[PDB]
Amino acid sequence: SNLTPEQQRYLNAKKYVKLFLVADYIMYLKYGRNLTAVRTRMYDIVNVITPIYHRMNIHVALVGLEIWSNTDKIIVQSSADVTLDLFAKWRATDLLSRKSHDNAQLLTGINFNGPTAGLGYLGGICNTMYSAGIVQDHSKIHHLVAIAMAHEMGHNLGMDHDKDTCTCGTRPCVMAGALSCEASFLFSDCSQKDHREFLIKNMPQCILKKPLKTDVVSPAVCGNYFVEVGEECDCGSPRTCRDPCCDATTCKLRQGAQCAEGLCCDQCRFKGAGTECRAAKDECDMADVCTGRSAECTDRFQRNGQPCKNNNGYCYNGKCPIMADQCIALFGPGATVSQDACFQFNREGNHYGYCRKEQNTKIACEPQDVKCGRLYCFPNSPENKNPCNIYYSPNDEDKGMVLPGTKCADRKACSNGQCVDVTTPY
Amino acid sequence: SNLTPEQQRYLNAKKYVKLFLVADYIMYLKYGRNLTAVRTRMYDIVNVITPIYHRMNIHVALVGLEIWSNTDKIIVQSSADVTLDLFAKWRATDLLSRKSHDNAQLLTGINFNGPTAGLGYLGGICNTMYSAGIVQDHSKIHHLVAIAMAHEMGHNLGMDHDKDTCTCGTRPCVMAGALSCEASFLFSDCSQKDHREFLIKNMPQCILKKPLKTDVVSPAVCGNYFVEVGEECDCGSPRTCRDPCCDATTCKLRQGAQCAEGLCCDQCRFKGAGTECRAAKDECDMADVCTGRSAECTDRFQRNGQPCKNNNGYCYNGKCPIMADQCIALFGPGATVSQDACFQFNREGNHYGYCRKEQNTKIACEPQDVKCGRLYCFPNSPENKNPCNIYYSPNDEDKGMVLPGTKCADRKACSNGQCVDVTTPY
Numbered sequence: 001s002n003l004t005p006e007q008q009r010y011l012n013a014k015k016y017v018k019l020f021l022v023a024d025y026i027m028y029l030k031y032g033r034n035l036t037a038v039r040t041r042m043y044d045i046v047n048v049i050t051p052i053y054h055r056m057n058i059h060v061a062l063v064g065l066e067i068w069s070n071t072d073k074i075i076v077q078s079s080a081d082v083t084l085d086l087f088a089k090w091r092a093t094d095l096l097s098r099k100s101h102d103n104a105q106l107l108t109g110i111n112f113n114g115p116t117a118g119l120g121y122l123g124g125i126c127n128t129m130y131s132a133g134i135v136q137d138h139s140k141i142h143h144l145v146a147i148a149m150a151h152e153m154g155h156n157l158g159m160d161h162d163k164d165t166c167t168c169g170t171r172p173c174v175m176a177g178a179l180s181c182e183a184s185f186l187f188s189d190c191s192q193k194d195h196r197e198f199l200i201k202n203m204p205q206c207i208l209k210k211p212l213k214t215d216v217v218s219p220a221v222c223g224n225y226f227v228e229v230g231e232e233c234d235c236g237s238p239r240t241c242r243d244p245c246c247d248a249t250t251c252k253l254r255q256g257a258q259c260a261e262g263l264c265c266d267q268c269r270f271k272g273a274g275t276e277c278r279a280a281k282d283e284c285d286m287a288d289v290c291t292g293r294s295a296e297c298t299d300r301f302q303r304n305g306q307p308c309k310n311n312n313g314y315c316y317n318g319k320c321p322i323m324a325d326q327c328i329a330l331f332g333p334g335a336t337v338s339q340d341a342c343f344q345f346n347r348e349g350n351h352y353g354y355c356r357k358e359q360n361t362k363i364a365c366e367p368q369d370v371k372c373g374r375l376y377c378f379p380n381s382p383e384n385k386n387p388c389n390i391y392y393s394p395n396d397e398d399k400g401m402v403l404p405g406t407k408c409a410d411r412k413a414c415s416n417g418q419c420v421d422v423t424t425p426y
Numbered sequence: 427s428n429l430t431p432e433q434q435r436y437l438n439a440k441k442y443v444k445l446f447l448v449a450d451y452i453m454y455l456k457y458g459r460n461l462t463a464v465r466t467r468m469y470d471i472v473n474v475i476t477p478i479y480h481r482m483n484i485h486v487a488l489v490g491l492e493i494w495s496n497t498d499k500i501i502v503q504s505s506a507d508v509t510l511d512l513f514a515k516w517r518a519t520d521l522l523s524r525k526s527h528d529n530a531q532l533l534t535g536i537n538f539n540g541p542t543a544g545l546g547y548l549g550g551i552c553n554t555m556y557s558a559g560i561v562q563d564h565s566k567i568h569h570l571v572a573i574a575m576a577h578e579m580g581h582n583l584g585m586d587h588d589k590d591t592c593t594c595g596t597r598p599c600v601m602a603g604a605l606s607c608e609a610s611f612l613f614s615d616c617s618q619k620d621h622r623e624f625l626i627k628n629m630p631q632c633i634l635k636k637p638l639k640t641d642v643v644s645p646a647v648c649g650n651y652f653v654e655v656g657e658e659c660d661c662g663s664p665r666t667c668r669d670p671c672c673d674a675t676t677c678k679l680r681q682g683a684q685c686a687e688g689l690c691c692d693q694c695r696f697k698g699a700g701t702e703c704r705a706a707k708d709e710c711d712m713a714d715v716c717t718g719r720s721a722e723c724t725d726r727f728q729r730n731g732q733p734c735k736n737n738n739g740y741c742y743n744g745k746c747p748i749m750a751d752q753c754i755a756l757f758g759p760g761a762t763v764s765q766d767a768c769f770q771f772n773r774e775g776n777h778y779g780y781c782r783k784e785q786n787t788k789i790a791c792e793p794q795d796v797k798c799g800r801l802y803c804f805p806n807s808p809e810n811k812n813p814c815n816i817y818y819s820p821n822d823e824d825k826g827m828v829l830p831g832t833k834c835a836d837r838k839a840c841s842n843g844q845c846v847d848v849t850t851p852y
């Protein structure tokens with residue numbers, strides 16, 4: 001109704017925050033130079049964060065853990081602001097290059113100036129440079145440090161501080177503005193809305209990808225609604241378990257059953273081979289089918305080259321990359337594709353107008369490949385007086401270039417800066 | 427159930443706890459290698475502890491502050507028991523030889539194994555071995571850490587943990603068995619009664635000595651119940667102060683006031699010249715009188731030479747030192763003074779037998795000053811076979827020597843390892 005079938009579908013999807021935790025040098029000393037103790041402290045903290053976020057339809061999964069026992073990798077300091085900035089930066093150039101994860105939190109033993117015990121970018125979830133938070137190991141009671149960490153992840157997820165009239169009960173909520181040991185594990189009604197709205201407007205993609213059981217480095221917990229190595233199923237505690245196929249007490253399948261949760265499981269048995277589990281969502285998707293022996297249902301799409309969106313594009317890995325949609329994504333609503341003559345600028349091989357790079361040398365487009373180099377857009381309005389406009393980033397010169405798989409002519413799409421036949425496998 | 431004059435006199439005396447605080451390397455790093463920040467943290471803690479103890483008639487005074495900003499002087503470990511043992515030993519070895527104080531507390535940034543945040547010796551106040559405690563800077567809230575420290579100092583002062591039946595109101599008291607952020611700043615009735623009994627039974631002497639205004643290393647504070655440099659009076663914070671003589675806001679005496687506290691002060695005025703402020707406690711004491719120009723009552727004694735203890739001793743600076751009590755004070759009940767022949771070992775001039783030290787060289791006693799060197803005693807045990815026994819401490823060779831002013835002959839007393847006539851001013 002108010003939400004597109006895309007938004008609606010995104011909201012109903014199960015969310016997962018693949019968390020990476022870091023403990024600083026002071027944490028290592030604080031716990032007696034006992035990596036076993038530091039690690040344990042971190043597990044206990046995640047064991048508290050997880051149930052807190054389950055009430056927000058998000059499963060927090062520790063997919064990575066690092067302890068700077070040898071020395072800090074960033075300049076951890078009294079200023080929370082500077083530390084956050086340095087941690088996020090380090091996360092972007094160092095950590096994200098060797099370990100994929102949706103969010104990172106720094107647990108430090110230092111004392112931040114002021115009464116705050118943490119800091120996090122508001123709405124930075126999934127962002128390559130802002131999905132981060134830092135937390136002070138401010139109390140001996142670990143469930144209070146977990147709440148502080150949950151609070152920062154709260155901001156990361158688009159939530160603000162609870163204001164005078166927000167409530168979750170008789171006690172303070174996770175997003176309360178200040179500390180207290182009366183802190184509960186519940187989110188206020190306001191946080192619920194903020195978060196929901198944030199998702200509606202931003203739909204961060206990374207939290208839809210479920211972590212592999214083998215990617216979780218935290219000791220398995222039976223009853224946390226996530227199947228971890230050593231478990232066959234997990235429907236929660238024996239009191240909340242609604243899955244007849246699973247014995248919530250042992251996290252083992254109940255005699256007979258072959259599976260429990262999933263699109264390819266019926267009455268505790270593998271759906272029939274060739275049975276449809278997930279229908280196609282769009283003209284570039286292909287109905288998914290069960291294999292009979294598996295419990296999960298692999299997702300497959302149409303073969304690249306399938307005409308889509310009223311002969312305006314060709315399917316590419318599940319999507320329908322169109323030049324009109326790209327212009328809108330770069331310059332906002334109203335943006336239209338520039339007239340053909342504008343693309344001639346790509347034959348220049350100049351600083352912005354080219355088709356590809358050999359290594360660092362920009363190679364001008366061929367007369368026939370003009371539509372596969374730099375994208376030229378025109379914000380359609382009475383004002384603007386320039387038919388040709390480009391989007392450029394000094395950080396990544398590839399940004400603003402026509403996307404691969406984009407229709408560049410009849411029966412042709414861009415491959416590697418070249419307009420080629422969609423009938424040839426790509 | 428009765429109370430002796432000495433006990434009541436002890437109970438009535440104002441108490442002081444000349445406190446020495448130490449911070450370990452972790453504290454240094456925890457506060458960004460900022461000595462100002464660390465010191466401020468310690469002052470803040472002292473600020474919460476002082477009003478907590480003034481209610482117990484105890485005036486806390488910081489006479490020492492040491493921050494191990496280079497290296498720990500001991501191996502600070504996650505085991506509390508081991509860290510206490512090591513700290514107390516470092517205190518009894520490296521700190522007391524460099525500074526005189528009544529009790530020391532180690533404020534560490536490390537985490538102690540278990541739920542505890544500190545440890546201290548029960549009733550070890552003033553003891554050179556056990557007047558110590560350790561406290562974990564376990565919370566960002568400095569007033570909670572302060573309560574933890576007051577708890578250890580509490581143990582040091584003879585208080586046990588509270589029982590379910592002990593109370594000080596609605597919130598838990600300082601001596602609560604376990605942590606909690608609802609902790610109050612009050613001592614339960616049980617703690618107050620145990621403490622009274624501990625004082626009547628042990629009467630620790632170091633807490634009777636008031637520290638000089640120049641011994642306090644903490645920045646002067648108006649409202650800390652201690653008259654420091656630049657203050658005329660101090661009755662605590664303006665809100666609590668009930669002193670009709672003091673201006674709590676400026677720590678200045680109000681208009682028409684000559685004094686605020688003192689045995690020779692009454693209703694803000696000096697008592698008349700000649701008024702008795704302290705009755706003589708014994709035969710070597712003399713009733714003291716006010717000058718009419720001072721709030722204090724200088725303790726004057728009988729003139730040295732005054733025969734005391736049924737002509738067995740001569741008054742010396744308010745006391746009647748005699749060999750018979752000295753032997754008991756060194757070897758316990760039953761010990762008596764050895765026969766004259768024993769003191770001849772002082773003519774030796776060697777290790778234990780001598781009269782005094784010139785510098786690093788021991789001088790032997792001349793036949794006449796034989797009874798003014800090392801004291802000789804012997805136990806009453808029927809199994810004792812030795813007539814001459816001495817007390818020796820390689821730590822302080824003077825310990826065990828006949829006390830100054832001790833009666834050595836018919837009408838003579840020991841001076842500087844010499845038996846001189848008591849008819850000469852001394």
Ligand SMILES: *[C@@H]1O[C@H](CO)[C@@H](O[C@@H]2O[C@H](CO)[C@@H](O)[C@H](O)[C@H]2NC(C)=O)[C@H](O)[C@H]1NC(C)=O
Nearest residue numbers: 031032033034035036037038039040041504539
């Ligand atoms: C390192 O820390 C760990 C845990 O913090 C210590 O192991 C604990 O040892 C106690 C016995 O004193 C057991 O009751 C706990 O169950 C252990 N914890 C776990 C689950 O490992 C370990 O002793 C420490 N090592 C050192 C040398 O300090």
Ligand SMILES: *[C@@H]1O[C@H](CO)[C@@H](O[C@@H]2O[C@H](CO)[C@@H](O)[C@H](O)[C@H]2NC(C)=O)[C@H](O)[C@H]1NC(C)=O
Nearest residue numbers: 078079113458459460461462463464465466467
């Ligand atoms: C070193 O730590 C001290 C903390 O005592 C900082 O000095 C000021 O301390 C007062 C409290 O006593 C605060 O109100 C001020 O805000 C502190 N200064 C500021 C503006 O930070 C001092 O700044 C610290 N120095 C460094 C290098 O951070």
Ligand SMILES: [Ca+2]
Nearest residue numbers: 221222226234
């Ligand atoms: Ca599980």
Ligand SMILES: [Ca+2]
Nearest residue numbers: 286287288300
């Ligand atoms: Ca599909």
Ligand SMILES: [Ca+2]
Nearest residue numbers: 647652654660
């Ligand atoms: Ca003062």
Ligand SMILES: [Ca+2]
Nearest residue numbers: 712714725726
């Ligand atoms: Ca006197």
Ligand SMILES: [Co+3]
Nearest residue numbers: 480483485651
């Ligand atoms: Co007082």
Ligand SMILES: [Zn+2]
Nearest residue numbers: 151155161177
């Ligand atoms: Zn916040």
Ligand SMILES: [Zn+2]
Nearest residue numbers: 577581587603
């Ligand atoms: Zn205790």
